[PDB]
Coordinates of C-alpha atoms and ligand atoms in Angstrom, one line a residue:
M12 CA 127.3 152.3 116.4
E13 CA 130.1 150.0 117.9
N14 CA 127.9 146.8 117.2
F15 CA 127.0 147.6 113.7
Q16 CA 129.2 147.7 110.6
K17 CA 127.9 150.1 107.9
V18 CA 127.6 148.4 104.6
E19 CA 126.1 151.1 102.3
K20 CA 123.8 154.2 102.4
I21 CA 120.3 153.2 101.4
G22 CA 118.7 156.6 101.4
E23 CA 118.0 160.0 103.1
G24 CA 114.9 161.2 104.8
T25 CA 112.5 163.8 106.3
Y26 CA 114.3 163.1 109.7
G27 CA 117.4 161.2 109.1
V28 CA 119.8 158.9 107.1
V29 CA 119.3 155.1 106.4
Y30 CA 122.2 152.5 106.2
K31 CA 122.3 148.9 105.4
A32 CA 124.2 147.5 108.2
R33 CA 125.6 144.2 109.7
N34 CA 125.3 143.4 113.3
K35 CA 128.9 141.9 114.3
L36 CA 126.9 139.9 117.0
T37 CA 123.9 138.2 115.3
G38 CA 125.7 138.3 112.0
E39 CA 122.3 140.1 111.1
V40 CA 121.9 142.1 108.2
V41 CA 119.7 145.2 109.1
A42 CA 118.6 148.8 108.1
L43 CA 119.9 151.5 110.5
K44 CA 118.0 154.8 110.6
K45 CA 119.9 157.7 112.3
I46 CA 117.8 160.7 113.4
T47 CA 108.3 161.8 124.4
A48 CA 109.6 160.2 121.1
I49 CA 111.2 157.4 123.3
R50 CA 107.8 156.1 124.6
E51 CA 106.1 156.4 121.1
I52 CA 109.0 154.5 119.4
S53 CA 109.0 151.8 122.3
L54 CA 105.4 151.4 121.5
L55 CA 106.1 150.7 117.8
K56 CA 108.4 147.9 118.8
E57 CA 105.5 145.9 120.1
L58 CA 103.3 146.6 116.8
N59 CA 104.5 143.6 115.0
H60 CA 102.9 142.2 111.8
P61 CA 103.9 140.3 108.8
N62 CA 103.2 143.3 106.7
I63 CA 104.9 145.9 108.9
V64 CA 108.7 146.1 108.8
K65 CA 109.8 144.9 112.1
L66 CA 111.4 147.5 114.4
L67 CA 114.2 145.4 116.0
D68 CA 115.8 147.7 118.5
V69 CA 115.8 151.5 119.6
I70 CA 119.3 152.9 120.7
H71 CA 119.3 156.2 122.3
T72 CA 122.9 157.4 122.7
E73 CA 124.7 160.9 122.5
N74 CA 121.4 162.9 121.7
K75 CA 121.1 160.7 118.5
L76 CA 118.5 158.1 118.0
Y77 CA 119.1 154.9 115.9
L78 CA 116.3 152.6 115.0
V79 CA 117.2 149.2 114.0
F80 CA 115.0 147.6 111.4
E81 CA 114.4 144.4 109.5
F82 CA 116.1 144.9 106.0
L83 CA 114.3 144.3 102.9
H84 CA 116.0 144.5 99.6
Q85 CA 113.8 146.8 97.5
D86 CA 111.1 149.5 97.7
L87 CA 108.0 149.8 95.7
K88 CA 109.2 153.0 94.1
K89 CA 112.2 151.2 92.6
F90 CA 110.1 148.1 91.7
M91 CA 107.5 150.5 89.8
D92 CA 110.4 152.3 88.0
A93 CA 111.8 148.8 87.0
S94 CA 108.4 147.5 86.0
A95 CA 107.3 150.7 84.1
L96 CA 107.6 149.4 80.5
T97 CA 105.6 146.3 81.2
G98 CA 103.4 147.2 84.1
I99 CA 103.2 145.4 87.3
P100 CA 100.9 142.2 86.5
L101 CA 97.6 142.9 88.1
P102 CA 97.5 139.7 90.4
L103 CA 100.7 141.1 91.9
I104 CA 99.0 144.6 92.3
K105 CA 96.1 143.0 93.9
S106 CA 98.2 140.8 96.2
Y107 CA 100.1 143.9 97.2
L108 CA 97.0 145.9 97.9
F109 CA 95.5 143.2 99.9
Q110 CA 98.6 142.7 102.3
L111 CA 98.9 146.4 102.8
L112 CA 95.4 146.5 103.6
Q113 CA 96.0 143.6 106.2
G114 CA 98.8 145.7 107.7
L115 CA 96.7 148.7 107.7
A116 CA 93.8 147.0 109.4
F117 CA 96.3 145.7 112.1
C118 CA 97.8 149.1 113.0
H119 CA 94.5 150.8 112.7
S120 CA 92.8 148.5 115.0
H121 CA 95.5 149.5 117.6
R122 CA 94.8 153.2 116.9
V123 CA 98.3 153.6 115.0
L124 CA 98.4 155.8 111.8
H125 CA 101.2 155.7 109.4
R126 CA 100.5 159.4 108.0
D127 CA 103.0 159.3 105.3
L128 CA 102.5 156.2 103.0
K129 CA 104.4 156.5 99.9
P130 CA 105.8 153.9 97.3
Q131 CA 109.3 154.5 99.1
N132 CA 108.0 153.3 102.4
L133 CA 106.6 150.0 101.1
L134 CA 109.1 147.4 101.0
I135 CA 109.1 144.1 99.1
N136 CA 111.0 140.8 99.1
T137 CA 111.5 137.8 96.9
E138 CA 108.7 135.9 98.5
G139 CA 105.9 138.2 97.3
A140 CA 105.6 140.0 100.5
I141 CA 105.0 143.7 100.9
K142 CA 105.5 145.6 104.2
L143 CA 104.7 149.0 105.6
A144 CA 107.7 150.9 106.6
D145 CA 108.7 153.8 109.1
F146 CA 105.2 153.2 110.7
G147 CA 104.0 155.5 113.3
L148 CA 107.2 157.5 112.9
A149 CA 105.3 160.8 112.5
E150 CA 115.0 167.2 100.3
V151 CA 111.5 168.2 99.4
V152 CA 108.7 166.0 101.1
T153 CA 106.4 164.5 98.6
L154 CA 102.7 165.7 98.7
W155 CA 101.3 163.1 96.1
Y156 CA 99.9 160.7 98.6
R157 CA 98.4 163.3 101.2
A158 CA 94.8 163.0 101.9
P159 CA 92.6 166.4 101.3
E160 CA 91.7 166.7 105.0
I161 CA 95.4 167.0 105.9
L162 CA 95.8 169.8 103.1
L163 CA 92.8 171.6 104.1
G164 CA 94.3 171.8 107.7
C165 CA 92.4 169.3 109.8
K166 CA 94.4 168.9 113.1
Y167 CA 92.8 165.7 114.2
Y168 CA 92.8 163.5 111.2
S169 CA 92.1 159.6 111.4
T170 CA 93.1 156.4 110.0
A171 CA 91.3 157.4 106.8
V172 CA 94.4 159.3 105.7
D173 CA 96.2 156.2 105.1
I174 CA 93.4 154.6 103.2
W175 CA 93.7 157.7 100.8
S176 CA 97.5 157.4 100.4
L177 CA 97.1 153.6 99.6
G178 CA 94.3 154.4 97.1
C179 CA 96.8 156.8 95.4
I180 CA 99.5 154.2 95.4
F181 CA 97.0 151.6 94.0
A182 CA 96.1 154.0 91.0
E183 CA 99.7 154.5 90.3
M184 CA 100.5 150.8 90.1
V185 CA 97.7 150.3 87.8
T186 CA 98.4 153.4 85.4
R187 CA 102.2 153.6 86.0
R188 CA 101.8 157.3 86.5
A189 CA 101.4 159.1 89.8
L190 CA 97.7 159.8 90.4
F191 CA 98.1 163.5 91.9
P192 CA 101.6 164.6 91.4
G193 CA 101.2 168.1 93.3
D194 CA 104.5 170.1 93.6
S195 CA 103.0 172.4 96.2
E196 CA 100.2 172.2 98.7
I197 CA 97.8 174.1 96.5
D198 CA 98.7 172.4 93.3
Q199 CA 98.4 169.1 95.1
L200 CA 94.7 170.3 96.3
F201 CA 93.9 171.5 93.1
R202 CA 95.1 168.4 91.2
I203 CA 92.7 166.4 93.6
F204 CA 89.7 168.7 92.8
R205 CA 90.5 168.6 89.1
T206 CA 90.0 164.9 89.0
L207 CA 87.5 164.2 91.8
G208 CA 85.5 167.5 91.6
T209 CA 85.9 170.6 94.1
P210 CA 84.3 169.2 97.2
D211 CA 81.3 170.9 98.7
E212 CA 79.0 170.2 101.6
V213 CA 77.0 167.6 99.6
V214 CA 79.8 165.3 99.2
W215 CA 81.8 166.4 102.4
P216 CA 79.8 167.8 105.0
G217 CA 81.8 170.3 107.1
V218 CA 84.5 170.8 104.3
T219 CA 83.8 174.6 103.8
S220 CA 84.6 175.0 107.6
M221 CA 87.9 173.4 107.5
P222 CA 90.8 175.7 108.4
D223 CA 92.2 176.2 104.8
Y224 CA 89.2 175.9 102.8
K225 CA 88.4 179.0 100.8
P226 CA 85.2 179.8 99.1
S227 CA 87.4 181.3 96.3
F228 CA 88.6 177.7 95.4
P229 CA 87.8 177.0 91.7
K230 CA 84.8 174.6 91.2
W231 CA 85.9 171.9 89.0
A232 CA 83.6 168.9 87.8
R233 CA 84.4 165.4 88.9
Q234 CA 85.8 163.0 86.2
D235 CA 84.7 159.5 85.7
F236 CA 87.0 156.8 87.1
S237 CA 86.8 155.0 83.8
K238 CA 89.2 157.9 82.5
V239 CA 91.2 158.1 85.8
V240 CA 92.6 154.4 86.1
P241 CA 91.9 152.7 82.7
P242 CA 92.1 149.7 82.2
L243 CA 91.3 148.7 86.0
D244 CA 88.2 146.5 86.0
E245 CA 84.9 147.5 87.6
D246 CA 85.8 145.8 91.0
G247 CA 89.0 147.7 91.3
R248 CA 87.6 151.1 90.3
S249 CA 84.8 150.5 92.8
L250 CA 87.2 149.8 95.4
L251 CA 89.4 152.7 94.5
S252 CA 86.4 155.1 94.4
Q253 CA 85.7 154.2 98.1
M254 CA 89.4 154.8 99.1
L255 CA 89.3 158.2 97.6
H256 CA 86.0 159.4 99.1
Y257 CA 86.4 163.0 100.2
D258 CA 84.6 162.7 103.5
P259 CA 87.0 160.7 105.7
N260 CA 83.9 159.2 107.5
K261 CA 82.6 157.7 104.1
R262 CA 86.1 156.7 103.1
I263 CA 86.4 152.7 103.3
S264 CA 88.2 151.3 106.2
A265 CA 91.1 148.8 105.7
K266 CA 89.0 146.0 107.3
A267 CA 85.8 146.8 104.9
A268 CA 88.3 146.9 102.0
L269 CA 89.6 143.5 102.7
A270 CA 86.1 142.0 102.1
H271 CA 85.7 144.0 98.8
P272 CA 84.7 141.7 95.7
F273 CA 87.9 143.0 94.1
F274 CA 89.8 140.5 96.5
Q275 CA 87.5 137.4 95.5
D276 CA 90.4 136.0 93.6
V277 CA 93.4 137.4 95.3
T278 CA 96.6 135.2 95.2
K279 CA 100.2 135.6 96.3
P280 CA 102.5 135.8 93.1
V281 CA 106.2 136.1 93.2
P282 CA 107.6 139.1 91.8
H283 CA 110.6 139.1 89.4
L284 CA 113.2 141.0 91.5
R285 CA 116.6 141.5 90.1
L286 CA 118.9 142.5 93.3
Ligands
LIG301 C1 114.8 152.0 107.1 C2 114.0 150.7 106.9 C3 112.6 150.8 107.1 C4 114.3 149.6 105.8 C5 114.5 148.6 105.8 N1 114.8 148.0 104.7 C6 115.0 148.8 103.8 N2 115.3 148.6 102.3 C7 115.3 149.5 101.5 O1 115.3 150.7 101.7 C8 115.8 149.1 100.0 C9 117.1 149.2 99.4 C10 117.6 150.4 98.9 C11 118.8 150.5 98.7 C12 119.7 149.5 98.8 N3 119.3 148.4 99.3 C13 118.0 148.2 99.7 S1 114.5 150.5 104.3

C-alpha cells in the first residue's frame, strides 16, 4: 500500500502472503498480511494482550484486505529448528508455555478461539516474550496440531481445541520431534489413537456419535506418557496429559493450567536469538 514500503517476504499462508514492511509515516516496522470478515477483524483489533501479536490496523481497499501487525523477528518453528541439537532449555519451554496459556486464558475469556495454533504462529522476541499470532483469523495445511474433535467432524468445537494444539507444541519443544505428524486426516487421527489409545465411550462420552467416527476404527491401546515425552518430569507430564484429554470437557482450561504445580517455579529466561 502507498503508506508502506515492502522490505521482504516473510512467508506464505493459507489465506495470503506476509511481508515485513516499513511505514513511511510512523517509521514503524510492521508485518503486512495481504488476503462479515470486516466486523470480525475489527473485533480482533480490540483483543489486546502482551501475549497476542497486536493487530495495528485493517485496510480494506480494492477487494484486497491488508492486516497490519506488530512485527516480531522470529517464530517458534525457526527457533525450534535452530535449537534442535541442544533442545530448548526447560525453564524457557516452561516460560513460553505459561505465557501462551496466559494469552489463551485471555482470548478464551472473551470467547475467542485461535483454531490453528502451530509453531509457525507463535512469535518470539529478544526479551523472552512469546506471542500468539493470526488469532481469530479463522501449500498443504498442517494437521499436526488439530484436536481430535475437529478431525472427527464436530461443527461446534470449543476453546479446548487450542489447549490440545498447545499441548502438542509443548511435547514438541520437549522432545524435539512433532508429537503427531499426520500427513492426512486419517493418518493424523490414527497417530493420535496409536499413542493415546483409540477413544471410546468410557474416556469420551459421545465420541461414537461424532460425524466422522467409524466403528471400524482400529482399537489401539494407550501408551504411557513416560514413553511419549521423556525426559519431561512428572509435573509436566501431568499437565500435558490434562491438555491432551480426549473429551474436550475433561480437557484442562488455560486458566486452570496456569495454576498447575508445573508452574510453581516458572521464570522468564532470555532466549539466545541470532537474527
Ligand atoms: C503476520 C504477523 C502475525 C507477523 C508478525 N511478525 C511476524 N514475524 C515473522 O513471521 C518472523 C520472520 C520471518 C522471516 C523474516 N523475518 C521475520 S509474522
